[PDB]
Amino acid sequence: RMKQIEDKLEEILSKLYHIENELARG
Amino acid sequence: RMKQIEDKLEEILSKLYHIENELARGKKLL
Amino acid sequence: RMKQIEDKLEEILSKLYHIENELARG
Amino acid sequence: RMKQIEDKLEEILSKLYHIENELARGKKLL
């Protein structure tokens, strides 16, 4: 429940790092 | 409740896939 | 506590919509 | 706990400001 929200957060954050890599390339 | 939180989380996530895909569409066409 | 997390979520989501507008322009 | 959640939320937020600012830096130089 609280872990579940944190878990999803962690995934969200990984996407943001992947969006930064897409930007570093372009 | 957690219902709204869970829906916001999925919507956040989906918007993130969308952005990633816009960025990817852009590098191709460049 | 649960509102607080939701509140922050809502802000996060507004940024994502603003990032979409920045992309629609460029 | 909520401590970790709150730190992840701030970090999410900060990364979002950063991205917005990279996008804004890019449109100027274009």
UniProtKB/Swiss-Prot annotation, chains B, D:
**Record localization:** Nucleus
Q: What happens when the gene is disrupted?
A: Abolishes recruitment of the mediator complex to the upstream activating sequence (UAS) of amino-acid starvation responsive genes. Decreases RNA level of genes involved in amino acid biosynthesis and cofactor biosynthesis during amino acid starvation or methyl methanesulfonate stress. Growth dependent on amino acid supplementation. Sensitive to amino acid starvation. Sensitive to purine starvation. Decreases cellular glycogen levels during glucose starvation.
Q: Which residues cross the membrane?
A: none
Q: Where is this region: Leucine-zipper?
A: 5-26
User: What induces this one?
Assistant: Translation is induced by amino acid or purine starvation, or during growth in low or poor carbon sources. Translational repression during nutrient-rich conditions is dependent on four uORFs (upstream open reading frames) present in the 5'-UTR of the mRNA; these promote ribosome dissociation. Translational induction occurs in conditions reducing translation machinery efficiency, leading to ribosomes scanning over the uORFs, and increased translation of the mRNA. The rapid translational induction is followed by transcriptional induction at later time-points, independently of the uORF sequences.
Q: How is it modified after translation?
A: Phosphorylated by the cyclin-CDK PCL5-PHO85.
Q: Function, please?
A: Master transcriptional regulator that mediates the response to amino acid starvation. Binds variations of the DNA sequence 5'-ATGA[CG]TCAT-3' in canonical nucleosome-depleted 5'-positioned promoters, and also within coding sequences and 3' non-coding regions. During nutrient starvation (low or poor amino acid, carbon or purine sources), it activates genes required for amino acid biosynthesis and transport, autophagy, cofactor biosynthesis and transport, mitochondrial transport, and additional downstream transcription factors.
Family label: Belongs to the bZIP family. GCN4 subfamily.
What is annotated about its quaternary structure and interactions? Homodimer. Each subunit binds overlapping and non-identical half-sites that flank the central CG base-pair in the pseudo-palindromic motif 5'-ATGA[CG]TCAT-3'. Interacts with the mediator tail; the interaction with GAL11/MED15 is direct. Interacts with the SAGA histone acetyltransferase complex. Interacts with the SWI/SNF chromatin remodeling complex.
How does the record comment on the protein's domains? Answer: Residues 89 to 100 and 106 to 125 define the N-terminal activation domain (NTAD) and the central acidic activation domain (CAAD) respectively, which can function independently to promote high-level transcription of the target genes.
Name of the featured protein: General control transcription factor GCN4
| Species of provenance | Saccharomyces cerevisiae (strain ATCC 204508 / S288c) (Baker's yeast)
User: What fragment of the whole protein does this chain represent?
Assistant: 249 to 278 of 281
